[PDB]
């Protein structure tokens, strides 16, 4: 079960639950970005923690290994430069 | 069961030997054009898996699973070919 | 079961025990202001698990298993910038 | 079963086939005090695909995750600057 | 089951065999406020001596690893190059 969402800045994504109690993040990647600053991908659980940092041309992508419980209503957001981030992974149970 | 295809820029790849396919690397090959190039997956939308650019970053390892969901692979960006490599898998 | 802690410099953290094992998945800086900073675990001996700096490398993935019962310890050493540890919990 | 080979430039490696083991997994590639400063590719041969790109004092090592079928008598070679490459992995069944 | 060792430059390390577990997984190699400025390689022995990674003071101080070593093979780990210690960190695993 493939998972993918494009995380627009100032849009907070709570991942939709197809079927699967958990979600696994495998990749984060920018998309021909315009703003030239760093951007953080964050999960809100509480507390709000940085899972990765992208800064346009220097580092446009990074692998991930993040498990998120969907029943825990985990939240995903960007905070740095105003750029969209492409999340890619797969669904998983418990 | 080894998997490998060279993705020409103006070519969209649909990978079915096994049920799922695991991507292990995308890598350039003596590229000539200098801009960035993205590797993309289409499964209900079109998502970037990685970004490659001559000199800056010519390859990256991958850990992406795709259900053989009639997923599609394409490159976007520089007029450069990209070597996708991985392996097949059941369940 | 998601895990996350912000390890302030000169605060030594023993990870919270959600009802047994913990896997470290990421270490990452956060708009740092101040050189290198190391993330360390003190399992008897004290081992560097990763190295972060302001401009060269602000985050890195991790793949570390830690026993919570073994009272393993986490600390940063070097430049005084906060580090976001992120991972997930696991049993046995 | 540990696997290790030094892939000299312009010498084609077909990994020795252990009886019992059918597949071989590549886990890491790394340079060794290289002399020529150009880039070098590691390749596997249906077709001949670049599995990694290494370069002196720029990117000397990389992790790998390549499974190769031993019965298919697949081939490994480096193609670029005249530098040797250290492949490390393990033998495996199914 | 955590594993960690600091490989001094003059030392060949054979990882301790914790019974119950059979394999050992290397997760990281990382320097520790190094003093010498040359590059240093992390190597595994056996018949051969193979480089798993390369570390240097200012350019690249750590790298992730994903190396499986069978404890049955009593493999050896050493660094060769600049006189710097390298912190190997990982965990034990069964089968």
Author numbering:
A (entry chain C): 1 to 19, 21 to 46, 48 to 96
B (entry chain D): 1 to 15, 17 to 18, 21 to 46, 48 to 72, 74 to 96
C (entry chain E): 1 to 19, 22 to 36, 38 to 46, 48 to 96
D (entry chain A): 1 to 45, 48 to 96
E (entry chain B): 1 to 46, 48 to 96
Article sentences:
Nucleoplasmin class of histone chaperones perform histone chaperoning function and participate in various developmental processes in eukaryotes. Our structure-function analyses characterized a nucleoplasmin isoform from the human malaria parasite, hereafter termed PfNPM.
The structural analysis revealed that both the N- and C-termini ingress and egress through the distal face of the pentamer. The residues Phe2, Tyr3, Tyr92, and Tyr93 of all five monomers form aromatic corners toward the distal face of the structure. This could be due to the presence of acidic residues on loops L2, L4, and L6 of the monomers exposed on the distal face of the pentamer.
